[PDB]
Design an enzyme around this catalytic site. Structure first.
Site, short mmCIF file in Angstrom:
data_model
loop_
_atom_site.label_atom_id
_atom_site.label_comp_id
_atom_site.label_asym_id
_atom_site.label_seq_id
_atom_site.Cartn_x
_atom_site.Cartn_y
_atom_site.Cartn_z
CG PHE A 142 -1.93 1.21 1.21
CD1 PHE A 142 -2.98 1.28 0.32
CD2 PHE A 142 -1.76 2.26 2.09
CE1 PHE A 142 -3.88 2.38 0.29
CE2 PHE A 142 -2.65 3.39 2.05
CZ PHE A 142 -3.70 3.41 1.20
CG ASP A 228 6.80 3.08 0.86
OD1 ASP A 228 7.11 3.90 1.78
OD2 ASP A 228 5.64 2.97 0.39
CE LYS A 257 2.20 6.83 6.26
NZ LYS A 257 0.84 6.59 6.87
C1 LIG Z 1 3.96 2.38 3.27
C2 LIG Z 1 3.23 3.64 2.76
N1 LIG Z 1 3.72 4.33 1.78
C3 LIG Z 1 2.97 5.51 1.31
C4 LIG Z 1 1.83 5.81 1.86
C5 LIG Z 1 1.07 7.03 1.30
O1 LIG Z 1 1.30 8.05 2.25
P1 LIG Z 1 0.21 9.30 2.14
O2 LIG Z 1 -1.02 8.94 2.76
O3 LIG Z 1 0.83 10.45 2.81
O4 LIG Z 1 -0.04 9.61 0.69
C6 LIG Z 1 1.27 5.07 3.01
C7 LIG Z 1 -0.07 5.48 3.59
N2 LIG Z 1 -0.44 4.82 4.85
C8 LIG Z 1 -1.83 4.83 5.22
C9 LIG Z 1 -2.34 3.73 6.12
C10 LIG Z 1 -3.60 3.69 6.49
F1 LIG Z 1 -4.07 2.67 7.27
C11 LIG Z 1 -4.59 4.75 6.05
C12 LIG Z 1 -4.10 5.73 5.27
C13 LIG Z 1 -5.10 6.78 4.82
O5 LIG Z 1 -4.91 7.32 3.70
O6 LIG Z 1 -6.11 7.04 5.53
C14 LIG Z 1 -2.66 5.81 4.84
C15 LIG Z 1 1.92 3.99 3.41
O7 LIG Z 1 1.43 3.14 4.42
#
Ligand SMILES: Cc1ncc(COP(=O)(O)O)c(CNc2cc(F)cc(C(=O)O)c2)c1O
Ligand SMILES: Cc1ncc(COP(=O)(O)O)c(CNc2cc(F)cc(C(=O)O)c2)c1O
EC number: 2.6.1.13
Lengths: 404, 404
Positions: A142, A228, A257
């Site tokens: 993800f 990642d 994050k």
């Molecule tokens: C490994 C990894 N690499 C990139 C990204 C994207 O980061 P971003 O959200 O800044 O675009 C994520 C996002 N994690 C995540 C986990 C979750 F349970 C819910 C959400 C949500 O959107 O509510 C987001 C990531 O887990």
């Protein structure tokens, strides 16, 4: 009077998209390891906003950097230079020992940047014909919600109803070196993107030697290794990067994050010049990428992780957490897994009893955690937590699990 | 001592990606319409960070909201509710008269969200077979740097070297109703995305009646009209939305940039329930989307535009600006265009004289502006500028243009 929790849920129901179904708790204050709802109830945060508040909620040093810089300058755009970005770029490249960083805002933008770097390096350095470059991903990945990110997902909740999908993305099993060796026989593969521990797949820790084997195969077949570390990086697993546990150096490292301590969306793409400089002026960027406010926040956030030895704390306390969680009866908790303070339990889901119900009751008993899959519960508190606080949290978890 | 401007340029050269070639000026402070570099030189900002600081740099009301909320809570993630998001959602949906908003962070994420909404509505409401849905875009469009956004671009600097590209994206000329009517004959088209004035194409204003004709054709053929107002919205053209000039209601409205006054990346996707609710819980989102700090900032930013009547100011002062710019000799400035305070001049580019050289000299004379295309210069100052300040800026522009 001020809205109650139910008021808050109902107002979002009326005026906001229905793209989430959050656990029913309405927070208005956070400090360190704790959160308070609008009724004044206090909770342990055992999600940490998916690693974004590793440093705890509202860390005073990170707040101070934000309040100092918001009085000076917050956004010039990249049409001009601001004075903060190079100070940040020097700091983070030296910290992680890569030539250069490309700043972006959200984690998915860091992933998109890495795919663009991999493709442009594949065409201009590796010699792949335009546009035959492929990128390999691991099933369960993800990395966000753009059309490209969902095109590499095997989760139908990510992709169903949103195609057609991005070509050139191939998927192999996680934690499977023979399958990677088989995928890299195609000389049109430019890169392999992989999480060192899969977060949303359920804290899936690969076998010892996987990350070294990935590095060896990528080098052998002239493929970029993209790690990642947007959730696993920045001390959450008990090292600066989860790849440090096998002394592995990826070609591209993605951060996000915790890079901001939760005060600002800041993300980062690290790599050396032979990869970075395949993107020329005018070919990539972002309005807010590298703005001076996010950069001051990111410098402070990184300094906090270093000065407070949060990776050492995450390692030592993660071992306590997994050891205590493993004492729960095997017939109810079937697996405990994780590294550092990124952990999960697996539940013996039944017709009636599931991860959602456990998390509702954890909330009743003062602890906030999030389910996934119906039998998986994440346990990931902020890395500033102390042992005494950790042990009180475990007692909440025991009390809840054993109350059913 | 503190780094000089040249030091600042050199440090970014060493440690940052080379994805931009900014105008050589190194800013450390911004307030209202002005910017100061590290040597203490004062400049008029005539870029406004591509509309993000409509309210001026560091607007005290928006700063105050940020400083008040950063002490309470900045990020819970959407695994839980925070108390601010629904207050913001109610405010912005009432302000723009749509049922609902979906919060994201950057402009390109708002665009990605709109493509996902258009596709999911095309499959679930319009009845298009999975995955045959198409989205139509206008040549010249720019909506960001993800693989999907560059797949709709006709600009080789956006897409060259980064394919293969997203399928299902068709491109027609801008400002061309017959071409749109021809494209919408395919019942597999789900939407048309279009900027009401094309920003990075060079402030390309379509002919009167274009936006009404787009609305009529989309309705006739059961296609969603997506209006990308990320640069044109929020008073920059002299109305709340540039589509207000023809009393046109898009199906989906995209906002960003000025939504935060430049203090935080906040973006928004507005539409009614029949479109919004095609996305179900768990199918879309973002880590930082809808976080309480960005929401407090966005409420304040929106309030500033309303309370200070910035759309009226942009309209009245834009007319002064274009009228004065049109007095420059036709042999050197061949076109003046724009609406409100989104304007551009076109230069008679020669072998030696170009938009870059004009902007270098504008900087020498105290004004910061950005070229595009080599003969196009954007003029877009913050909307809090006063007439006296505007007229002094025009005198800088005259002095510079007529110095060659
Ligand atoms: C490994 C990894 N690499 C990139 C990204 C994207 O980061 P971003 O959200 O800044 O675009 C994520 C996002 N994690 C995540 C986990 C979750 F349970 C819910 C959400 C949500 O959107 O509510 C987001 C990531 O887990
Ligand atoms: C109409 C419209 N819609 C969406 C977006 C994406 O917004 P965002 O950047 O938050 O993803 C933009 C971006 N504008 C822009 C213009 C420019 F000269 C340089 C940059 C840069 O990246 O340096 C960005 C846009 O103009």
């Amino acid at each position: 009077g001020p809205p109650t929790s139910d008021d808050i849920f109902e107002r979002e129901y009326k005026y906001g998209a229905h793209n989430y179904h959050p656990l029913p708790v309405a927070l208005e204050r956070g400090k360190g390891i704790y959160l308070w709802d609008v009724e004044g109830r206090k909770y342990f945060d055992f999600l940490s906003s998916y690693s974004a508040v590793n440093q705890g909620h509202c860390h005073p040093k990170i707040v101070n950097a934000l309040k100092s810089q918001v009085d000076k300058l917050t956004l010039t755009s990249r049409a001009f230079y601001n004075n903060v970005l190079g100070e940040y770029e020097e700091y983070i490249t030296k910290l992680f020992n890569y030539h250069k960083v490309l700043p972006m805002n959200t984690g998915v933008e860091a992933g998109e940047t890495a795919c663009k770097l991999a493709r442009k390096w594949g065409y201009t350095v590796k010699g792949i014909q335009k546009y035959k470059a492929k990128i390999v991903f691991a099933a369960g990945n993800f990395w966000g919600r753009t059309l490209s990110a969902i095109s590499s997902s095997t989760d139908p909740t990510s992709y169903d109803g949103f195609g057609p999908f991005m070509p050139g993305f191939d998927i192999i099993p996680y934690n499977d070196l023979p399958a990677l060796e088989r995928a890299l026989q195609d000389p049109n593969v430019a890169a392999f993107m992989v999480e060192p521990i899969q977060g949303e797949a359920g804290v899936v820790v690969p076998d010892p030697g996987y990350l070294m084997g990935v590095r060896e195969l990528c080098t052998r077949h002239q493929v970029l290794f993209i790690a990642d570390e947007i959730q696993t990086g920045l001390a959450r697993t008990g090292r600066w990067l989860a790849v440090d546990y096998e002394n592995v150096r990826p070609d591209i490292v993605l951060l996000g994050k915790a890079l901001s301590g939760g005060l600002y969306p800041v993300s980062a793409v690290l790599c050396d010049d032979d990869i970075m400089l395949t993107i020329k002026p005018g070919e990539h960027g972002s309005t807010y990428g590298g703005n001076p406010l996010g950069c001051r926040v990111a410098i402070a956030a990184l300094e906090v992780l270093e000065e407070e030895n949060l990776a050492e704390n995450a390692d030592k306390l993660g071992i306590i957490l997994r050891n205590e969680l493993m004492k729960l009866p095997s017939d109810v908790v079937t697996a405990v897994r994780g590294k550092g303070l990124l952990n999960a339990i697996v539940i013996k889901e039944t017709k009636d009893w599931d991860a959602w119900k456990v998390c509702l009751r954890l909330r009743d008993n003062g602890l906030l955690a999030k389910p996934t899959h119906g039998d998986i519960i994440r346990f990931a508190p902020p890395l500033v937590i102390k042992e005494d606080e950790l042990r009180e949290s475990i007692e909440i978890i025991n009390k809840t699990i054993l109350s059913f």
